[PDB]
RNA sequence: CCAUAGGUUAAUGAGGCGAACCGGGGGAACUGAAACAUCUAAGUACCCCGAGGAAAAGAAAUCAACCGAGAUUCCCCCAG
RNA sequence: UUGAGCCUUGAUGUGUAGGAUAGGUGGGAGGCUUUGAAGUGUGGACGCCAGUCUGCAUGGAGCCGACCUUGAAAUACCACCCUUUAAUGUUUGAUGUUCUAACGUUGACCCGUAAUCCGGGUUGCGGACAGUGUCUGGUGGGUAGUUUGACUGGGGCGGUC
RNA sequence: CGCGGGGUGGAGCAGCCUGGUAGCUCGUCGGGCUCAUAACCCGAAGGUCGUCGGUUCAAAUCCGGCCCCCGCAACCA
RNA sequence: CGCGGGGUGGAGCAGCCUGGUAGCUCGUCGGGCUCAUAACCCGAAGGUCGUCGGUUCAAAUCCGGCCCCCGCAACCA
């Protein structure tokens, strides 16, 4: 299944945990190893049911850095994704993106969503690892 | 618990490790055999400095009288003849209480807590082996062989 | 009697009450059970009749420590 | 399916119902088939014809198992007990040999007196 | 084996009775509710154990109220 | 052994348009390959038996993205995940067998002891069952406490309130 | 009073749960049947998913109600 | 005296609760089969719903009187 590139993307960043904002904003130059330079989009799994028309959280968020406003709305499972820009701006750029969008989703807090919200917000580059965020 | 070992467990312990069992485990076969004794404060420095020195090893050398034991007969065989019928067919079954009594005046001074019978009680006339455990890990392999007297 | 020897505890008494309330009296018995210890002093086996509870009380204190409190309180062990 | 290599193919050719059951050398069980369950039902079901499709259905359903060769055990009177060995050599098996294993007591137990 | 259990002897004390009161262990029913089952009667009657001249309780892991009072016991209010 | 939750990781998913035993979504067009290639021998896994998946290796370093037919693009690469499912780790649960130390012993023998009680001691048989306490559902006139109306051309019966 | 659900030709049941593509067994004709009746066997006839909205390429299915049949546990005005 | 049920083609029974449309088996009548009858197969007819009145758009049915039948009751001194 998996050889010389596939893995190594995976060796490097720990599976098993959950950094911090700060911390994967950093680790993602160590990933994006194409030709191009890629961009990052962002898995956040909403607290919500999509088997429920009430609770559709659906918007659209200004990137401070751009990629350039953003247009999203999730699944009919759960996740919504949106990107935050080119992998090539800065860490702190990014930093500044990611945040943007949590408050934008609490911007949009469903009213019959009964439960946690996010639960896990993850975001990863073209040829990324799964990274999820604190 | 956490009833803290004096021996080697055959399952968890390692003497010296301070390993969490079931109440009636400890309560009932590790306390009144010295297989460990109970991790209270105080009891753990008795252990932690003069026996895990000392004493531990003493212990381990008498495993080594174990490996000693296993060899206390010289030719290894002890032949019993008593009374039976014909065909073989022993009279009367001997147990684990006169092969305590029939090695101890024959070689290994073996007590009846150390004697088993692995295949029966022995009736019939002929080879058996009565496997003596001079060590919980070691055993013995003496061979016995009952003929119709 | 049904008198536990290290705990102490004894045959308290109370009420049934029904789906309907109804008072009745019952009888609450501690969980008694004669279990042998281990001392390591005697080096021998100390027959006691102990609650479930006296056994946790004897598994934290010494068996020895017991026995002593027993001796204080008069008690054939 | 466990893949066995050899197995037994019973026939139970009774007066009105023939089973088929095929079981490795051991006696286990692989699959079966009768000649009530595959149609064929009441005057028909005693026909050596419906013991022939019998065997067919039985042939298959012990595909997963493999058997190449096998022995033969009938049993019983029956319409089929010849219609059925020619159907299970049809089907692809290599009849190693047949055994007959009607069960017949030496004046056992008293027989019915029925049918006037 | 030792040793314990047990056995023998001496020393000190205890045992029983007593009117109520007192603490503790058990603990009814008739009755009232215009019937009766929760409830009341009542923790009363009564039974048992223990003690004294009194007994009990008792020196806050108590109240109060963000001002303060300072163990327990008993009486009048609080308040039917 | 065998259920269930979960982790890691690996498979799984042929209305029909069809080069595809493609689910939704989705960032982005180079991964890929000589940290030993396409094609294949042959077997297993999978299977609506349509076509995937794949170990070693003769072979020997190529293979392929938007392109065009889709309601969707190409597990080339990656992310969050859904039904279906594999190995392992962990987590408790329910069964089966064995073991012996708890416990039982109204089995044997010995002593206390001239004592079929009892206790202790050896030993045999059972054995984490049995039995007992707290909680708990069922059954329960075996037992206890009670209720079972009034009017009425006497009461009952009928009827009425 | 909830918490579970289950509703489909005449009718008992599927398929739904995991989105497109409704099968099954009796109740009726044509027969074949045979000197005949019986029985048997062969092919036919019949619900677009109890009802209405949303999401969606596509709804019997997923999400909301309505009408129920219930399965009980409740049930101290 | 009281309570409760019934009365439906020639026979025995459904239908009545929850009003507008009355059905099953036997028998009868006609045909066929057989040498003829029975059985068997095919077709059809046949009911003032005890009786009188009332309620109502409509009464076998809902209500009331009478006649007949059936079971229960007709008790304590
Ligand atoms: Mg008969
Ligand atoms: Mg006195
Ligand atoms: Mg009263
Ligand atoms: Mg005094
Ligand atoms: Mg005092
Ligand atoms: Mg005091
Ligand atoms: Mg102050
Ligand atoms: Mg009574
Ligand atoms: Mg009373
Ligand atoms: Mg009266
Ligand atoms: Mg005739």
Redesign the pocket.
Known sequence: ??????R???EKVD??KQYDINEAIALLKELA?????????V???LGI?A????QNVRGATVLPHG?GQ?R????????????I???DFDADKLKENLEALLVALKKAKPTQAKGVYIK?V???????????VD | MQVILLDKVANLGSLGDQVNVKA??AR??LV??GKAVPATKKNIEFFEARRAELEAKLAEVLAAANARAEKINALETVTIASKAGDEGKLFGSI???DIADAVTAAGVEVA??EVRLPNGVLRTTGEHEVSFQVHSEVFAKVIVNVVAE | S?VCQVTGK????????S?????T????????????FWVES?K??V?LRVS?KGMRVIDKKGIDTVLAELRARGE?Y | ?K?VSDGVAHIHASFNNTIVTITDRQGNALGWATAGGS?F????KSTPFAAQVAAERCADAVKEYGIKNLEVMVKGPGPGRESTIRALNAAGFRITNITDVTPIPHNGCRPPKKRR
Not at chain 1, 33 to 41: H, L
Not at chain 4, 41 to 44: A, M
């Open positions: 299944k998996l050889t010389k590139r596939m190594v993307i995976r599976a098993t190893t194409a030709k191009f330079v890629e961009s990052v989009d898995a956040v799994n049911d088997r429920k028309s009430d990629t953003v999203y709305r999730n699944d009919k499972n759960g996740i919504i994704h949106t990107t820009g080119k992998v896990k993850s975001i990863s580059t073209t040829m990324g690892a799964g990274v999820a | 009636g485990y009932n076969f009144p055999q147990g684990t209480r009846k807590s | 049904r004894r045959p308290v008494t109370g009420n049934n009450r789906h309907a309330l109804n008072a009296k019952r009888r609450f018995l501690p969980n008694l059970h004669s279990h042998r005697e021998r086996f027959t479930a054939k | 399916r893949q149609g039902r009441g005057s028909r």
